[PDB]
Structure 1
């Protein structure tokens, strides 16, 4: 995966500041070379971990269904990069897994591809690209983890639990608003029935 320091700070500074405040830590203003703070890197690590987890949860704005992953034409190998949080198939039971560091077709027992596969992939994207609701949820979860890893404060743990529940509720609301998901004329089975 990625190291915490590699990415620059644009709006992750606010998330890091919130994580450090969930424990009393005063807010930094740099989140850069001029940090020299052991509680800032340990907050960015938590933020990255939680961002990866939330993205891997499989939300509708980062499923990017219909990829056309292409293999090297001289080696015929697709790479199952660590950024690929979840690789699946549009149809039912999926046949793509990770052997070594390359996609492996378990049913065909071969990792050599000629044309290119189509999958339902979740490619990791920076914390900035997350919507506001998802950013708030990630910040709250990272705050809870930071507090209970480094300080404790059971009352703060309870408050963060409530905030995490509220943030998850908001994120789910955003997801259902985003998708639409009409059970009639939107379903993959009922829509055909309504043909009349």
Structure 2
């Protein structure tokens, strides 16, 4: 699992943590560097948790289709990193699982590959790499969970519940606009049925 607190802070990550701190009324911090601020450290942990959770759900922008994972030539092992939020097959039923930190073919009962495998993969990205609407949803969900766990204010709980639903709605609008999905000619099955 990637360490959230071991790299330099970005401006957006500084903004996100302070937004989470604001949810319970904590004043903003100038830096995420260790100042013994338990609240800021807790907020960053929840920010990382929510960042991993929403990305792992799967969206057109972050789902990578047709990605090749190359094996080591001498060990024939493909690493299944903890930053692989989702690893699927390109079509049909998926055959690859995680076994000991390496890719395992459950149908062939083998973890040895002579060549790269093509998978539909979600790889963890920085919160800085998220779209603006997705950043807002991550912060809103992190703020809601932060208040529930470390303050518990029931009035704050209700408003952040509504804010997250609105934040998730606008992320769904982004995903549909980004996807540009068509059930007539963008459809795997129906587009073939349209040929005359």
Using the size of structure 2 for normalisation, the TM-score is 0.94
Once residues 17 and 27 of structure 1 are traced to their aligned partners in structure 2, the CA distance between those partners, rounded to angstroms, is 11
Higher strand share: 2
Q: Is the Cα–Cα contact under 8 Å of residues 87 and 121 in structure 1 kept in the other structure?
A: yes
Name the SS of the counterpart of 1:119 in structure 2: strand
Note the C-alpha offset of 1:152: 1.0
Kept in 2, the 8 Å contact 1:19–1:146? The answer is no
Compute the displacement of 1:6 (Å): 1.2
For structure 1, list consecutive stretches of 5 or more residues without a partner in the other structure: none
Aligned residue number for residue 10 of structure 2: 10
Equivalenced residues, count: 196
Matches of 1:103 and 1:151, distance apart in 2: 41
Quick check: 1:140–1:163 contact (8 Å CA) kept in 2? yes
Contact 1:79 1:103 (8 Å CA) reproduced: yes
Distance verdict in 2 for CA 1:20–1:182, change over 3 Å = closer
Cα gap change, 1:22/1:29 in structure 2, threshold over 3 Å: closer, same or farther?
A: closer
Distance change in 2, residues 1:188/1:21 (3 Å): same
Per-residue CA deviation, residues 156-181 of structure 1 (Å, 9 max, x unaligned), is 00000000000000000000000001
Query: Distance between the aligned counterparts of 2:181 and 2:60, measured in 1?
Result: 11
When structure 1 is superposed on structure 2, of 20-29 and 168-177 the one drifting more is 20-29
* Aligned CA distance change for structure 1 residues 153 and 32 (closer, same or farther; 3 Å): closer
Q: Per-residue deviation at 1:65?
A: 0.3
Offset, 1:9: 1.6
Q: CA deviation at 1:22?
A: 4.1
Q: CA deviation at 1:35?
A: 3.1
Q: Is the 8 A contact 2:86 2:121 kept in 1?
A: yes
C-alpha contact (below 8 Å) 1:88/1:121 kept by paired residues: yes
- Contact in 2 for aligned 1:23/1:147 (Cα 8 Å): yes
Residue 64 of structure 2: SS of its match in structure 1? coil
- 1:50·1:138 contact (CA, 8 Å) conserved in 2? yes
Structure 2 Cα separation of the partners of residues 74 and 17 of structure 1: 44
Does structure 2 conserve the Cα–Cα contact (< 8 Å) formed by 1:87 and 1:122?
Answer: yes
* Cα deviation code 1:132-191 (max 9, x no counterpart): 100000000000100010111101000000000000000000000000011111001111
Q: Is the 8 A contact 1:17 1:27 kept in 2?
A: no
Offset of residue 2 of structure 1: 2.2
Q: Determine the structure 2 residue equivalent to 1:105.
A: 105
What displacement does 1:36 show?
A: 2.8
- Change over 3 Å in CA distance of 1:7–1:25 after alignment to 2: farther
SS for the counterpart of 2:117 is coil
CA contact (8 A) 2:67 2:121 kept: yes
